């Protein structure tokens, strides 16, 4: 088990290296989104708007909130849910754009799921929740955390993490030419170069793009090992595995077929 062809072996080698970095950049993103789920759990507006509600109190709290929005860039959406999960604030940015600003309506979402889940958080735990998308192609990450003054709870932050933003941010590497995808431990993608493979697990006629039945052989390494590649004489595939803010794995995975494995130089 080890041998080989030495253009494809050097080139596994350079794929895992990236893998390596990427992934380490992942994991600074998702300490960026607790740090900054912190603050904005901490914040005074938030304080000040929980004990005196006014609409000047909001005005402020909002007028931060967007603040953070359009400085950070990576969130769709930032809300504050009651506990009894009333949205009081729901700022929406749009890196297009990037106009970050408060939205008018305001919604009762007790009903969803992942609601339920935030409830079953500890104060101050930031957890993830599955992967939305929005007409019906764009998707958020949403992420969860029970909010309490003195050990008192009092609402929920949620975040929508802009995974087509992080993605274009992320993903291919120009000095390398490497595109990293992203698989789902379900098996699904979440990103990637070739867009119809995308989301297998939310539209039903793309099922069939999912890692265990299109690389039966190598879905099981990639599963239980942090890092690693395979050969299958069709494709390479280099992986690894990192944890991203649930502590569900994430597949990081860079993929040639036999006709990429066409690898020169300029
Ligand atoms: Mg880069």
Known sequence: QALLANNVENTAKEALHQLAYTGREYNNIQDQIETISDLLGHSQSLYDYLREPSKANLTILENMWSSVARNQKLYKQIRFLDTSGTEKVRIKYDFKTSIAGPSLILRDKSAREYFKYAQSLDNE???????????????????????????????????????????????????????????????????????????????????????????????????????????????????????????????????????????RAT
């Open 125 to 263: 735990q930031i957890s993830a929740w599955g992967i939305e998308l929005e007409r019906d192609l764009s998707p958020s990450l949403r992420i969860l955390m029970p909010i309490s003054v003195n050990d008192v709870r009092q609402g929920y932050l949620v975040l929508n993490v802009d995974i087509e933003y992080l993605s274009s941010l992320l993903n291919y590497s120009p000095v390398r030419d490497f595109h990293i995808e992203l698989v789902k431990h379900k098996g699904f993608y979440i990103a990637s170069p070739d867009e119809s493979r995308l989301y297998g697990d939310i539209i039903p006629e793309r099922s069939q793009f999912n890692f265990s039945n299109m690389y039966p052989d190598i879905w099981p390494r990639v599963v239980s090992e942090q890092a690693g590649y395979s050969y299958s004489g069709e494709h390479l595939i280099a992986f690894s595995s990192i944890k991203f803010v649930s502590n569900e794995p994430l597949h990081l995975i860079i993929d040639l077929s036999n006709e990429q494995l066409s690898k």
